[PDB]
Design a protein around this motif. Structure first.
Motif, PDB file in Angstrom:
ATOM      1  N   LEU A 297      16.232 -11.768  -0.392  1.00  0.00           N
ATOM      2  CA  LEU A 297      15.093 -11.227  -1.179  1.00  0.00           C
ATOM      3  C   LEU A 297      15.258 -11.620  -2.649  1.00  0.00           C
ATOM      4  O   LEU A 297      16.398 -11.581  -3.146  1.00  0.00           O
ATOM      5  N   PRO A 298      14.198 -12.045  -3.392  1.00  0.00           N
ATOM      6  CA  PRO A 298      14.337 -12.315  -4.830  1.00  0.00           C
ATOM      7  C   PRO A 298      14.826 -11.046  -5.537  1.00  0.00           C
ATOM      8  O   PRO A 298      14.548  -9.967  -5.048  1.00  0.00           O
ATOM      9  N   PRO A 299      15.528 -11.105  -6.703  1.00  0.00           N
ATOM     10  CA  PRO A 299      16.044  -9.887  -7.335  1.00  0.00           C
ATOM     11  C   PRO A 299      14.923  -8.876  -7.610  1.00  0.00           C
ATOM     12  O   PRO A 299      13.857  -9.288  -8.021  1.00  0.00           O
ATOM     13  N   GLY A 300      15.210  -7.585  -7.443  1.00  0.00           N
ATOM     14  CA  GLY A 300      14.197  -6.551  -7.723  1.00  0.00           C
ATOM     15  C   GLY A 300      13.487  -6.138  -6.453  1.00  0.00           C
ATOM     16  O   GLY A 300      13.164  -4.942  -6.324  1.00  0.00           O
ATOM     17  N   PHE A 301      13.289  -7.065  -5.512  1.00  0.00           N
ATOM     18  CA  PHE A 301      12.689  -6.691  -4.202  1.00  0.00           C
ATOM     19  C   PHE A 301      13.667  -5.790  -3.440  1.00  0.00           C
ATOM     20  O   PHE A 301      14.776  -6.257  -3.120  1.00  0.00           O
ATOM     21  N   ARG A 302      13.268  -4.556  -3.137  1.00  0.00           N
ATOM     22  CA  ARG A 302      14.186  -3.617  -2.444  1.00  0.00           C
ATOM     23  C   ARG A 302      13.380  -2.731  -1.499  1.00  0.00           C
ATOM     24  O   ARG A 302      12.169  -2.964  -1.361  1.00  0.00           O
ATOM     25  N   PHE A 303      14.060  -1.801  -0.827  1.00  0.00           N
ATOM     26  CA  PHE A 303      13.344  -0.834   0.038  1.00  0.00           C
ATOM     27  C   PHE A 303      12.967   0.353  -0.841  1.00  0.00           C
ATOM     28  O   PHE A 303      13.803   1.255  -1.031  1.00  0.00           O
ATOM     29  N   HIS A 304      11.750   0.325  -1.390  1.00  0.00           N
ATOM     30  CA  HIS A 304      11.249   1.468  -2.198  1.00  0.00           C
ATOM     31  C   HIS A 304       9.969   1.970  -1.529  1.00  0.00           C
ATOM     32  O   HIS A 304       8.880   1.737  -2.085  1.00  0.00           O
ATOM     33  N   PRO A 305      10.002   2.680  -0.371  1.00  0.00           N
ATOM     34  CA  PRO A 305       8.763   3.061   0.316  1.00  0.00           C
ATOM     35  C   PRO A 305       8.079   4.311  -0.252  1.00  0.00           C
ATOM     36  O   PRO A 305       8.756   5.152  -0.814  1.00  0.00           O
ATOM     37  N   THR A 306       6.757   4.402  -0.095  1.00  0.00           N
ATOM     38  CA  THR A 306       6.026   5.605  -0.566  1.00  0.00           C
ATOM     39  C   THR A 306       6.358   6.773   0.365  1.00  0.00           C
ATOM     40  O   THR A 306       6.924   6.526   1.447  1.00  0.00           O
ATOM     41  N   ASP A 307       6.030   7.998  -0.049  1.00  0.00           N
ATOM     42  CA  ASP A 307       6.278   9.183   0.812  1.00  0.00           C
ATOM     43  C   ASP A 307       5.627   8.938   2.175  1.00  0.00           C
ATOM     44  O   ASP A 307       6.322   9.088   3.198  1.00  0.00           O
ATOM     45  N   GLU A 308       4.350   8.546   2.181  1.00  0.00           N
ATOM     46  CA  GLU A 308       3.601   8.339   3.450  1.00  0.00           C
ATOM     47  C   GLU A 308       4.232   7.201   4.255  1.00  0.00           C
ATOM     48  O   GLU A 308       4.323   7.339   5.486  1.00  0.00           O
ATOM     49  N   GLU A 309       4.635   6.120   3.585  1.00  0.00           N
ATOM     50  CA  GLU A 309       5.198   4.948   4.307  1.00  0.00           C
ATOM     51  C   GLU A 309       6.413   5.395   5.125  1.00  0.00           C
ATOM     52  O   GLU A 309       6.557   4.927   6.266  1.00  0.00           O
ATOM     53  N   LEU A 310       7.229   6.293   4.578  1.00  0.00           N
ATOM     54  CA  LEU A 310       8.429   6.770   5.310  1.00  0.00           C
ATOM     55  C   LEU A 310       7.993   7.487   6.591  1.00  0.00           C
ATOM     56  O   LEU A 310       8.442   7.074   7.676  1.00  0.00           O
ATOM     57  N   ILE A 311       7.119   8.484   6.479  1.00  0.00           N
ATOM     58  CA  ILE A 311       6.718   9.276   7.678  1.00  0.00           C
ATOM     59  C   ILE A 311       5.988   8.366   8.670  1.00  0.00           C
ATOM     60  O   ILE A 311       6.454   8.262   9.816  1.00  0.00           O
ATOM     61  N   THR A 312       4.927   7.687   8.235  1.00  0.00           N
ATOM     62  CA  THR A 312       4.087   6.887   9.169  1.00  0.00           C
ATOM     63  C   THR A 312       4.819   5.677   9.761  1.00  0.00           C
ATOM     64  O   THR A 312       4.761   5.519  10.993  1.00  0.00           O
ATOM     65  N   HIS A 313       5.506   4.875   8.946  1.00  0.00           N
ATOM     66  CA  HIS A 313       6.098   3.618   9.483  1.00  0.00           C
ATOM     67  C   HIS A 313       7.505   3.810  10.060  1.00  0.00           C
ATOM     68  O   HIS A 313       7.892   2.982  10.905  1.00  0.00           O
ATOM     69  N   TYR A 314       8.213   4.883   9.702  1.00  0.00           N
ATOM     70  CA  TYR A 314       9.617   5.005  10.181  1.00  0.00           C
ATOM     71  C   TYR A 314       9.842   6.280  11.001  1.00  0.00           C
ATOM     72  O   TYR A 314      10.228   6.155  12.179  1.00  0.00           O
ATOM     73  N   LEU A 315       9.583   7.456  10.427  1.00  0.00           N
ATOM     74  CA  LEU A 315       9.887   8.724  11.147  1.00  0.00           C
ATOM     75  C   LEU A 315       9.009   8.867  12.393  1.00  0.00           C
ATOM     76  O   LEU A 315       9.565   9.154  13.468  1.00  0.00           O
ATOM     77  N   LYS A 316       7.691   8.699  12.241  1.00  0.00           N
ATOM     78  CA  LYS A 316       6.743   8.889  13.376  1.00  0.00           C
ATOM     79  C   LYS A 316       7.171   8.066  14.599  1.00  0.00           C
ATOM     80  O   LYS A 316       7.310   8.678  15.674  1.00  0.00           O
ATOM     81  N   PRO A 317       7.343   6.715  14.548  1.00  0.00           N
ATOM     82  CA  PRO A 317       7.700   5.957  15.749  1.00  0.00           C
ATOM     83  C   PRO A 317       8.993   6.474  16.389  1.00  0.00           C
ATOM     84  O   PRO A 317       9.047   6.542  17.595  1.00  0.00           O
ATOM     85  N   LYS A 318       9.988   6.825  15.572  1.00  0.00           N
ATOM     86  CA  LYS A 318      11.280   7.329  16.106  1.00  0.00           C
ATOM     87  C   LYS A 318      11.035   8.645  16.850  1.00  0.00           C
ATOM     88  O   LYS A 318      11.532   8.785  17.983  1.00  0.00           O
ATOM     89  N   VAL A 319      10.223   9.538  16.289  1.00  0.00           N
ATOM     90  CA  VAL A 319       9.891  10.800  17.015  1.00  0.00           C
ATOM     91  C   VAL A 319       9.107  10.470  18.292  1.00  0.00           C
ATOM     92  O   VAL A 319       9.586  10.844  19.381  1.00  0.00           O
ATOM     93  N   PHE A 320       7.981   9.759  18.164  1.00  0.00           N
ATOM     94  CA  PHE A 320       7.132   9.411  19.336  1.00  0.00           C
ATOM     95  C   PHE A 320       7.951   8.619  20.361  1.00  0.00           C
ATOM     96  O   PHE A 320       8.210   9.146  21.460  1.00  0.00           O
ATOM     97  N   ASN A 321       8.348   7.392  20.014  1.00  0.00           N
ATOM     98  CA  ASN A 321       9.198   6.568  20.914  1.00  0.00           C
ATOM     99  C   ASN A 321      10.659   6.788  20.519  1.00  0.00           C
ATOM    100  O   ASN A 321      11.084   6.205  19.507  1.00  0.00           O
TER     101      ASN A 321
END
Lengths: 153, 148
Positions: B2-26
DNA sequence: AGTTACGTACGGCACACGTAAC
DNA sequence: TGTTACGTGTGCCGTACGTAAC
């Protein structure tokens, strides 16, 4: 490249000065995919996101600070629509124990006059200072070139 | 890479919808990283998503069988919730809640505080309906742990 | 005069921590 | 008795905005 969801460009202050503004000051042909170049003296913050690169919530842009007056030793912060206004004290950017940069916060006013109309557009201007103060710079465009992060409250 | 500065900085919603939800569902679904967070010291937690902030999964288990109060005790100390929770809305629909906890070393009624702060994001918005009735009885959450 | 910049408030946000509940 | 949460207090950040200055 395609970024996994949530992976975004949120650099620390020192990453901006060391890896972005510093190289550009030396090489005017430095190019970054994450950050484009505009003249905020011409472009307006409402039209800004249209002329942006890889940006949704925040938009990073390089800019050339122009001296307002010939002997003013000040900076032209006036636009067609309004004027960017400096607010609060500056923030020091330190690499290790050496000051390498300075951050200024600016809020846009549509008045273009003392009767400015406050807007929610806020710009974080990062400038090369300290170890890279113009006094010890090799005739490069240091004071001129500045990175600017624009966002809306 | 990743170019410098590019990191994992997700929004509050991005965490629940893209990460927590799939792990709970599947169950068990993505390189996000998972940890027991049971009797694990926070300074030993990195031993990494990011050296700035560590993002890890967690399985909240009830301290008391009838209490329903979740266990936040470690051998090294305890996590003390501060203030109130923060709403996470994907539009006009409440999807998650964020709880801020500050680590307090000592594991005592009056333990000495530390600079460890953890933002625990939970799927509270759809928790009541238990859309998927997981018999695993496992509450999955995601935590942004940093010592700042 | 016009334009910028300084600098001390002031409101929101992120906890610090006493006091109540499980 | 122990352990955990609740809820205001609060200190610090992010601006707001005169008042000065260029």
């Amino acid at each position: 490249i395609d970024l996994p969801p949530g992976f975004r460009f949120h650099p620390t202050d020192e990453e901006l000065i060391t890896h972005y503004l510093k190289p550009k000051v030396f090489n005017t042909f430095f190019s970054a995919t994450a950050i484009g170049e505009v003249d905020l003296n011409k472009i307006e913050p409402w039209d800004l996101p249209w002329k942006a690169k890889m940006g949704e919530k925040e938009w990073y842009f390089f800019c050339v600070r122009d001296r307002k007056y010939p002997t003013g030793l000040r900076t032209n912060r006036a636009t067609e629509a309004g004027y960017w206004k400096a607010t609060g004290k500056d923030k020091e950017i330190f690499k290790g124990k050496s000051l390498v940069g300075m951050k200024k916060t600016l809020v846009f006013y549509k008045g273009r006059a003392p009767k400015g109309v406050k807007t929610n557009w806020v710009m974080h201007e990062y400038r090369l200072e300290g170890k890279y103060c113009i006094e010890n710079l090799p005739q490069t465009a240091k004071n001129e070139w500045v990175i600017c992060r624009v966002f809306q409250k």
